């Protein structure tokens with residue numbers, strides 16, 4: 001089989017994908033070809049060398065290939081993983097650096113954390129100038145190529161905005177796309193914090209990408225929510241975040257639980273109303289110490305760490321290339337483990353589809369009735385069981401609460417429709433209309449000016465012309 | 469037949485209803501009984517005397533009765549017209565005055581035009597502290613009474629919020645309510661400005677209460693929107709409103725037309741985004757001279773005007789009580805016309821249901837498939853044909869645009885659900901959550917304080933306790 005990783009320049013992630021493949025029995029065979037593709041020659045090479053080296057040390061028969069041709073990566077593929085984050089190397093070092101520059105423009109026009117930060121949509125680098133033109137455009141191009149050169153492949157969309165893109169591709173191309181995100185892993189924080197063994201809990205989450213809720217939580221044959229209530233009464237007050245990313249049991253999470261009736265899970269906790277996000281001091285009240293990860297201090301700090309980690313991997317690539325005796329699985333155990341899968345859903349999905357290794361996943365697929373009061377065709381993030389017969393929606397029960405539907409999911413669904421409309425219409429009036437619905441907007445003149453300046457940045461030339 | 473007017477203390481409207489009934493040939497009969505009910509004795513009395521006086525001057529066999537009892541008004545009714553605007557007379561002269569005071573508290577806390585003014589919801593006196601407790605409570609009470617004591621009657625809801633109340637009554641009691649509003653009449657304004665004969669226009673509107681769109685506009689066999697475009701290019705810049713209410717052809721309405729692809733009709737124009745409403749100066753840019761009717765200047769002024777008109781009718785009632793020879797149809801023809809219906813929808817509806825006089829109306833009724841992409845059970849404002857077999861939904865064609873659905877109607881529907889949840893949940897957190905979605909909210913502490921003060925007002929004690937555990 002042929003597994004293609006588009007955007008392999010994202011080195012650490014591409015490596016953890018390869019590692020997961022080489023460590024998976026059913027997939028660790030001679031006829032498993034992994035194609036690594038990216039336009040960035042040096043980042044691609046670093047992933048390539050560290051990937052081949054890793055499989056050699058693991059003694060895995062898997063073949064690793066690299067290429068700079070999208071078409072070559074796609075042709076005849078069985079699985080295509082889209083993790084690309086387009087950017088202009090003349091102006092920026094990465095997509096996240098471009099997002100950061102635009103965010104700063106927004107901030108000077110009075111939009112704290114940028115125009116792309118909206119109610120229920122605070123997750124950083126999720127959308128770009130609202131309609132995410134570069135990311136949607138690329139996914140659509142991949143989807144259309146896949147329909148002709150790889151008619152049986154799954155497009156595994158990991159690049160953001162996952163919700164908008166999966167929905168756009170489905171609606172406009174009919175391509176075989178499935179959105180992947182792993183905010184569901186926040187549920188293990190909850191179990192731990194409450195002193196529960198994960199394998200003794202009967203749970204389910206459902207909702208929308210970065211918008212999922214613990215609809216079922218049961219322990220020793222009963223509702224386990226009373227246990228959370230106890231923890232809130234006794235432990236919430238003294239809760240402290242272990243790092244900027246640590247929000248699952250935060251005051252914001254529990255305030256949302258109090259209102260909605262179920263606990264928001266994972267990135268859902270980041271995606272709250274402005275109640276929790278007005279400014280950095282408000283964020284520190286609701287997430288404590290760091291103010292979470294989506295703020296002016298922590299986010300640029302995170303991106304810088306990413307950049308450095310990547311540059312270390314590139315250097316390490318150089319090392320192994322000159323000293324073929326280097327043992328990376330010994331030198332750097334955390335980056336190159338041998339008994340530890342990443343925990344990411346991508347490779348289990350592949351093993352499930354190809355090899356009938358049945359597993360429960362949480363993926364962005366069309367609703368088709370799983371959630372009542374939502375359209376069949378709406379892409380949602382659902383519990384599904386996957387095997388070689390395909391993707392089977394688990395019955396969602398109990399249902400999501402009324403408040404979650406009317407106050408959280410529906411408003412998020414409408415924003416998806418607004419962002420999609422902003423992309424397809426090529427109409428600047430839609431971009432304006434979105435900002436007019438933005439609580440931070442104080443005047444129409446403000447809306448016009450922030451968009452004028454953002455669309456006039458030199459690296460946004462194509463986007464500016466698109467809306468002209 | 470028994471036609472009950474609940475809230476007949478709203479003198480001029482109650483008279484308009486009586487007048488239409490008396491001038492309707494199939495309803496002018498001695499077994500047509502019009503009950504006027506209201507807890508306000510003076511006002512009820514004035515409606516009562518002027519009503520009986522008018523039906524005499526017309527020689528109608530219609531019987532007019534007055535009662536301060538809700539139960540008596542409802543018992544055995546065939547049609548119940550709820551036009552009540554509940555208010556505590558210990559504190560205020562009317563519902564409007566109460567709304568005005570609360571609005572000022574909100575403005576003091578930084579909410580221009582009050583917390584009850586929200587995006588797509590600028591119409592003054594439409595909701596009251598978001599959940600409209602007094603008005604929703606009353607409608608529900610009437611609904612349950614009606615199901616028991618008037619099992620076949622129609623509840624014709626006129627009092628606001630019509631959308632919220634109609635939906636709530638349908639969902640929680642399943643009672644036989646239909647919502648009535650007259651925004652659709654802005655369409656004739658469009659025809660007049662374009663120089664078109666109202667009788668030779670093929671038109672349709674659809675959407676939601678105070679949220680309707682001119683989805684079909686055809687003239688002499690051709691889409692007539694090109695004529696609107698023509699008018700915009702030639703006349704818009706010099707357009708001027710005739711009074712604070714004149715907004716149908718405003719720059720606001722046209723700006724919405726340009727974005728959505730269809731013209732907002734009637735009160736829909738008042739119900740825009742904050743783009744047209746940030747402050748009085750912004751209102752004047754988009755609605756010209758007066759800044760429309762929903763502002764700190766024109767609305768109190770209109771409310772005082774109403775109070776003044778009501779008081780003149782009460783004084784006239786006295787005049788007639790002490791001079792049975794006065795002919796009020798002569799003294800004030802404008803107020804007491806003959807051979808001239810108001811143009812309102814309520815009495816034609818009654819004539820259609822009762823006597824099979826078939827008529828096309830625009831009413832709030834369950835969607836039931838009329839509009840694609842909306843639930844069957846959602847209450848919407850639809851073109852319907854009415855007769856003794858009931859309500860027949862006209863085919864809606866052309867469809868409402870995508871933008872109208874995703875940017876206007878759906879956001880409007882969600883707000884109705886928010887407002888409903890704010891009522892039945894008895895939960896103050898829901899009132900808070902709504903203000904948290906509000907642009908003029910700058911902090912949570914602001915939200916807490918504005919609701920605290922509003923709920924602590926002496927006349928809001930019932931609501932205050934309702935929201936307490």
Ligand SMILES: [Mn+2]
Pocket residue numbers: 180181182183210267
């Ligand atoms: Mn994610």
Ligand SMILES: [Mn+2]
Pocket residue numbers: 648649650651678735
């Ligand atoms: Mn109305």
